[PDB]
Structure formats: structure tokens, C-alpha cells
Write a protein that binds this ligand. Structure first.
Ligand SMILES: [K+]
Ligand SMILES: [K+]
Ligand SMILES: [K+]
Ligand SMILES: [K+]
Ligand SMILES: [Mg+2]
Ligand SMILES: [Mg+2]
Ligand SMILES: [Mg+2]
Ligand SMILES: [Mg+2]
Ligand SMILES: [Mg+2]
Ligand SMILES: [Mg+2]
Ligand SMILES: [Mg+2]
Ligand SMILES: [Mg+2]
Ligand SMILES: [Mg+2]
Ligand SMILES: [Mg+2]
Ligand SMILES: [Mg+2]
Ligand SMILES: [Mg+2]
Ligand SMILES: [Mg+2]
Ligand SMILES: [Mg+2]
Ligand SMILES: [Mg+2]
Ligand SMILES: [Mg+2]
Ligand SMILES: [Mg+2]
Ligand SMILES: [Mg+2]
Ligand SMILES: [Mg+2]
Ligand SMILES: [Mg+2]
Ligand SMILES: [Mg+2]
Ligand code: NA
Ligand code: NA
Lengths: 89, 27
RNA sequence: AAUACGUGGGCCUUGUACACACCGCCCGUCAAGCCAUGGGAGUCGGGGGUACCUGAAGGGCGCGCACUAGGGUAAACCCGGUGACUGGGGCUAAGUCGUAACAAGGUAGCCGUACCGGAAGGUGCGGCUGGAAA
RNA sequence: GGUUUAAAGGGUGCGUAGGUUGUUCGGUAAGUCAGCGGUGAACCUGAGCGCUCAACGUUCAGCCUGCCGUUGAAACUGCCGGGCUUGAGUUCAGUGGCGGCAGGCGGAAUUCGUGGUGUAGCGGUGAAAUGCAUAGAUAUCACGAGGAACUCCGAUGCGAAGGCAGCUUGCCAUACUGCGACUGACACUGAAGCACGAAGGCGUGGGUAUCAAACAGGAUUAGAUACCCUGGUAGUCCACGCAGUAAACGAUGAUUACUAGGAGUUUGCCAAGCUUCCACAGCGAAAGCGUUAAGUAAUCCACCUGGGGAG
RNA sequence: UCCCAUUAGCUUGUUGGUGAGGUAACGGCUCACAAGGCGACGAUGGGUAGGGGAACUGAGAGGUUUAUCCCCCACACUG
RNA sequence: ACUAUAGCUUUACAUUGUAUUGGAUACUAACUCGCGGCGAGGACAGUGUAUGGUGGGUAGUUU
RNA sequence: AAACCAGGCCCAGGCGACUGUUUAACAAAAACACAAGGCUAUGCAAAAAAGCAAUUUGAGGUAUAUAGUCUGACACCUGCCCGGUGCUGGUAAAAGCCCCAGUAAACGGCGCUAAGGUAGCGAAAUUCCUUGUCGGGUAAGUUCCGACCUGCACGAAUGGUGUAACGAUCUGGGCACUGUCUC
RNA sequence: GGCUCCCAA
RNA sequence: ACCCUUGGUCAGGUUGAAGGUUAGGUAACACUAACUGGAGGACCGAAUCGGUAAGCGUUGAAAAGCUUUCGAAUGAACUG
């Protein structure tokens, strides 16, 4: 996960109103998906990093719970975010 | 923490493993 | 006369599966006697299912055609039995061989796993204290 | 009714269904509450009456305390809509680590080979022997080669658990504290299922120094298939893949809130967040636990029901 | 409104429709498009049993059985 | 089995020399090999004669 | 199925994994080969093979390669012995031999000894006695199948025990069918 | 004819 | 017999390996279903090669055959 403050700020500006909104469900889902992809890339090389695995799984669980909250609150926002991120698979 | 309780289980395990090792290689 | 006095009992603490009190308790194999129960070339039954072929009465359908109980056939399944031979287990006594555990039980004990031994068992590797002594 | 030690916590997590849900405002009326109505022989309960009494028979009052229908109530649970920031999460900053994976580097020790010096033993035990040695051992110096483990620091710390300790770097993960930042209950647990999971063991290919199951020899013994000694093969090492077990233990499942004192100790500023020992109340059969509970309570999961047969 | 998950998938008139026939009567009850229906709130299969009021029992919760009595169901050597 | 022998192997002489310090070391020029003179070896190796081992691989025979 | 044309099937054993090869002209097989396993030799003018030699093969390959030799897919495995025999080390004008050590997936052995047969099999392609004994199959079974074990005289790479598939292989029993037979 | 696939090239 | 160089031949039918595409599925690979694909000392069977069993022949049509039957038939194949 090549993650830094500049990338986090760019993600928060892209998803969610204003760049200071680090806590929005959309911002959190975007951040989780970004580091999930990067951790997958790391694992394909370090196939024996069982600690980076299950950290990946805990990130996946967090993203799923945020998506379930979006289901319970506003379905249209969930459709928009999964369309913009290409999550469902 | 008497000891006889574990001795009985140890005996049973010995007998079972001896049975299996005798039955191996025979078909 | 000779000859040096330094190397079985009591008190405190500790462990115990002993309380007839270590001349104690106690495992396991082989041999003996009863009881129950597994595996087995095979072999004998019981009813149900599937498919096929035949097929009554009584309706239906157009002196004949479906429908069907029942019959035969095959299979396969399920439920039972028996079988040369071949394995554990329980109980009773105590014949035989040892002493594995209980005290640091005389090689601390136990857990997992592997190999090996007439048997209790032994050894290797890792773990635990439900171990003394320190 | 229970689960530290009597039987009984899953090896540890993640997570599906399910179960439970901080605070506040407004609706609804599913649960809940209330009223009215219908419906529900004999036997069984107070009072009689008849059997000469009694069993018994019979009448009447007291049970209907279930189900159904229909009217109301709105505190709580549920459902719907809105709000809040304490729970939860994201951000920022500080600090920390034997946390994981991968690549490089190092010294001590041990084994083997070659050469130099030197000769009567070395090794081992309670005592010995097997063993190695004048065809030149042990000992000592140099050259060469290879494998494995990391003294002192070092008892603490980290990790979900199993576990993690030479040095260094790269890539990751994560804990704790605060923020004058953000979202606004987004939570807890979790049958299935999935992942990880000491040692030993299995397959393929490398490697093979030490130690060492099996095995061989020498001793001790009444015998010694052991304990002791000398050898010695799998294994112990690496990569990939199986396997899924443990006294996988704190013999103590996970969350949340609350409730005394002492003595130490690690970390960032008196105070958290830890990590260890005595010990109030309370709990317990006792040993004991005691703010890291086995105390006081709530939610969910696992498991137990005399011993053997029998995992 | 009983046990077994060492029983997890079952179903092709089977689920719905149109029409017709048939019946005391509605209906896949029967006969000539669509692919649905039932299922861990336990379908399907296997085993066992007639079901209630009574009766007995217990402080109650509950448990046992339906011998005689009453109600409902099933049957009359086997189809 | 007896007796030979191909092949293999040992040593001596020849091929085959020089120096140091003999018994080894060193040298290059005989000799050998490689690349297209240079490089690597080196009096060894290989070859001839003689000689001791071995030799059902082969042969002639006996029984 | 219209004639012609055009699988018989099932149950159970031994051996050999399999497709192949072989005694032209009496043997097609269980024999040979085989993919695969082990051991040994070989550092390159390689070892090895032909040739008096030159030279050629090996191979223009280089230890994941080449050669010699045994075993014969695969699964579970492959015990004890270095005493004997092989192999490896330390005279003519030094080898050897000795001695010591090693080597069994080397040959060989597994009864005073070097060790006195482990697992697994067993009246067997191995058992003389012998048509051993018991059970099955048949009216009757010297063959067959399943067991037992005093194995004349099994036994672990001259491999042990199994094994799906395969076979103009050897062997036993059924159904179908028939001039094989009653005849 | 070309194309595709394959290794024994 | 074996080898070397250069050529040729193998009717017809069957089965359905690797691989690929499309749906589901995963953090991502894996993995399930359909379609496709066309491998093989694969199957049945002519030519062809071989020679199992029986019958016949045995001063034979033939100094090794004939008839029926049977094995292989894209391969360690057959053949000039
Ligand atoms: K542990
Ligand atoms: K609430
Ligand atoms: K036979
Ligand atoms: K021809
Ligand atoms: Mg034992
Ligand atoms: Mg003892
Ligand atoms: Mg002891
Ligand atoms: Mg031993
Ligand atoms: Mg207990
Ligand atoms: Mg635990
Ligand atoms: Mg436990
Ligand atoms: Mg001769
Ligand atoms: Mg002559
Ligand atoms: Mg064959
Ligand atoms: Mg053949
Ligand atoms: Mg012939
Ligand atoms: Mg022939
Ligand atoms: Mg052979
Ligand atoms: Mg063989
Ligand atoms: Mg016969
Ligand atoms: Mg037999
Ligand atoms: Mg042999
Ligand atoms: Mg073929
Ligand atoms: Mg033909
Ligand atoms: Mg054919
Ligand atoms: Na291994
Ligand atoms: Na026939």
C-alpha cells in the first residue's frame, strides 16, 4: 500500500463533499478499496505473508459493513459508489 | 490431580496404538 | 591386660494413588473358566422399488381398445439370518513372567507424534507442572 | 443446575444466517395492556338431597384461568421518518516494538581434507570394555572446504493463537496516547463456512556439519529388548505441496459497565495504556480468586448430565 | 399436533393461466400455454403411533396412559 | 583342469638435457598439447627392448 | 435389422502393468522389450567400443551428459550378515604378496557360528508324502475357489506382497445355444 | 492453397 | 538381421485430453455449468502387415500353401 497523506486527501476530495470529510462512508469505502488493491498486489509477490492476509480480510469486512450501512440508509448512494469503484464481483 | 485417571487413559492409548501398528501392512 | 573415639533411634519440614498402614498398594502379557459382541469365501430368507411382458371383474372408449388388482421376469436397494475360519471386550478366581505407576517409586511424571520390543513398556523431538531438590 | 482443580470453554481468529441494540423527537399499532360479546356430556371444588352410614348417585352454586370477534390506551419492545455525540470508525500528530515476508553481510564454536612439529597413548565410566592409534593417533600451527546455531545484552516486549532473539535494508501490518478535524449507532456475538495453526510424520528436488529414533557393539544385572559407554540411518536444514494434532494451559470463550488497599515494573506526559506478587467486600466444597475476578450485572456462542465398554 | 440431518434438496399435473368435461359442490378433480412451487421458521425420505375429554400423579410448572365412560376418525380374511 | 597368449599393469635401459640443494626442487632446449609466432606442460608422459604381476577375453589340448 | 452384411454375455482365479517383439519351416508365451528405480564408471585426446596403426564411433555431446550392469508401470515396502569369493583403499638390470579397513539394489548366506529369515505370503507355475484336512460349489468334483500351517525344499530390486486397466495367455463355474453326444 | 494446434523441432 | 540417405501409403465410423470463450464465484487466483476444441504407441473396422484356432493338403496346385477363424491397422506402422 503506497499510501500517503496526499493520496488520502485526493481520495477524500474525489469522494464525499469537501476534502476535510475523511469520515464519510464513501470516503472510507474508497480508501478501503484502494489499499485492498495494493495489498493484493503485495501478496501476489509475498505469497507467504499470512499477516498481510487476514489484514486484507479485515479490510474487506470493514468495507462490507460500510456498504451494508449504505444499504440501510441510502440505496442510491450505494449504487453510485459501487458503480464508480467497480466493487461487485 | 490424582494420577490414576491419566494412567487409565495412557493404558487405553497404548492398547489402541498397538492394535493399529499390528494391523498395518496386512490386507 | 590391649585399644579409637570419628564415622540403628528422636524433633522440624516435605510428597503420597498407603490406613491390615512399604512384609503396603498396584499395572500388563501368556495360561484357565463363564458372558456379550465384531470381521469373513459363501449361503438362506423377508417384505418394498424400478423397468418389461402377461392380465380378472366392473366401469369407460370405438361382437374390440385403453384402465387395473393379480401374475411372471429380471435387476438394484433395504431389512434379517447362518457360515469353515479369524479378532477385541466384560466378569471370576488365581496358575505363570516381570515391576510400569503411587516417595525424587529408586531413569520426575504426563501430553502429542514416530520407530521398536514376551508384556507392563523403551527411546527420539517439541510441550506442560497436575514435580521434588535447589 | 452447572463448566480453574469433581463431567464440562471450541487451538485461535474472520465471518454467513440468527440472537441482542446509546440518546432524543414525531408517527404507526405487530408484540404488550384494558373493556365488551361469543364459545369452551361426564369427572373434579364449596353447599345441599337420597343410598339405615359410607363408597356411590343426584341437584345447585362456585372454575372456566384457553380460543375467536370487536372497541379503546401508548409507558416499553418492534416498524417508519428526523435529530445528537458519548459507542464505533476515518483523518492528523506523537511514540514504540524478538510483529510478518524477502534480499544481503558477519564472528565465535564444531566437522572433514592437505601440509609442518612430535611420539605412547587418546577417549570413556561408579569401575571398565567396545572404539581410534608406530601403514604415525590425541596434542599444536598453517592452508582449504562445507553445514548449522546466534554468548554477553537478556528479564522485559510484540503477535488472534501457534509463536517471535546475530547485524542490516526493502516491502507490509499493527498497538497505545492525544486531536479542538470528519461521519453520525454505522454496534456486540456468531451455528454453517473459510483462513492460520508447535513438535513429530508423508511426496518431489536440493543439502547433509552437530545431535540422534531404528539398528550394531561394549557394559550393569538372576535376565536388561532399558537406564551408562562407543558407533550409527531416517530425521533435525531449505523450497514447494500434504496433514490438522498437543498438558494447542491461565486446564479460566468473546464483549460492556461498575466495585478497596498495599509492593514492584515498561512506555509517551501526576496520569493513563500495560505487565507481575500480597490482599477489603464479595464469591467458593476447599485449595483459593480478588479491578488482568473465579465479585456485581446484561448480550451471544461452545460444552456437561455416574464409571467401564469407548472415542 | 412424536423421533432421526449417521435423512439436504424434493417436484413434471408439479405451480399458475385459458377453455372444456365432470361432481351435491369449488378445485389439476380430469383432459387439451408459461416455468413455476416447496425447502435449515426443516422440504423429501425412514421409524413409531389412532386423536381428544377423562383418569392417575405432583404445591405448581409439568409428566404417564387413553382399561372401563363420552366425542371424532379408521376397519370388517387380503386386494 | 593343463599350457600359452591379446590386452592391462610394474620396474630398468633408450628417446633424455641443465643448475641448485645427494633427494628432492627449479629451469628449457628434446618431446606432447591448444589458438592463430603466442600459450600450456615438460625430461615426466607416450613409444621400443627387457622384466615381474594379471589375464576363460582368446586359443590348443587333456579329463 | 428383412437377403448379403453384422459384438455372445456374466461370475471367479494364476502370470505378465499396459501398446509392442520372438524361434522364416511343429513353441506368440508367463519368454524379450518397455516407461521407470538403483548401483558403478567417466573432468573431456572422457570413460567405453572398433581397428596393427592412422583414424572413426561416443559427440562435436560435457556430469540434468555418456557408458556398463541388475530390477521392471503403480501402491505399501524392501529386515540380518563383510566370515567365503570379487572389487576399492593404505624379477630383470617396484608392483605384487602380506596385513588392516571398506563394499551386499556386489556374487553369496540367513546354521559350531559372519549372521542363524524381519514384514508379507504359504499344499503355491514352489508340497515328496498327497486325491493333506476343513468349508463352498455338484446327485456324485484327484481340477477350481476360501481357509489351516510340521514351508520334503517361500521370502524382500536373480525384488516381497497387492493392484484398476489390458491379453488370439493359462485355469474354474454359469446363462444363451446347438448333430459335440444319446444315435 | 494457405490457416490453427503440437513436440518428437 | 540391423543401420544410413531419399520417396510413398494408410476407406469409413467412434470417443472426447490439453487449450479457449461465455455465465457464476473470489481480495485475487483457484473452482462450477454450457458451448467450442480435436489429443491419443485411444476404440470398431476395409486396403495392408502378421499368423491365433480348426479343417484340408502331406509322390501337395505349393521344398511351408489353401479355406474359415483370428491380431494390429497414426504407429516402437507398413512399404519402394
Ligand atoms: K504451548
Ligand atoms: K432502544
Ligand atoms: K490353481
Ligand atoms: K504387398
Ligand atoms: Mg505404550
Ligand atoms: Mg518402578
Ligand atoms: Mg519412574
Ligand atoms: Mg531401542
Ligand atoms: Mg475435569
Ligand atoms: Mg482457550
Ligand atoms: Mg481441552
Ligand atoms: Mg577353452
Ligand atoms: Mg591338433
Ligand atoms: Mg504382456
Ligand atoms: Mg499384444
Ligand atoms: Mg516355428
Ligand atoms: Mg505358431
Ligand atoms: Mg525380470
Ligand atoms: Mg517381477
Ligand atoms: Mg475338469
Ligand atoms: Mg487354494
Ligand atoms: Mg536379491
Ligand atoms: Mg490403436
Ligand atoms: Mg483384412
Ligand atoms: Mg482394429
Ligand atoms: Na522431508
Ligand atoms: Na457358445
Amino acid at each position: 500500500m503506497y499510501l500517503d497523506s496526499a493520496k488520502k486527501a485526493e481520495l477524500f476530495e474525489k469522494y464525499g463533499k469537501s476534502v476535510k470529510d475523511t469520515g464519510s462512508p464513501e470516503s472510507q469505502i474508497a480508501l478501503f478499496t484502494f489499499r485492498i488493491a495494493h495489498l493484493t498486489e503485495h501478496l501476489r509477490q509475498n505469497k507467504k505473508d499470512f499477516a498481510t492476509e487476514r489484514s486484507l480480510k479485515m479490510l474487506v469486512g470493514k468495507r462490507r459493513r460500510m456498504l451494508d450501512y449504505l444499504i440501510k440508509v441510502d440505496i442510491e448512494r450505494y449504487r453510485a459508489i459501487i458503480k464508480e469503484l467497480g466493487i461487485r464481483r | 490431580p490424582n494420577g490414576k485417571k491419566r494412567k487409565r487413559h495412557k493404558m487405553a492409548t497404548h492398547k489402541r496404538k498397538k492394535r493399529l501398528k499390528k494391523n498395518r501392512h496386512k490386507k
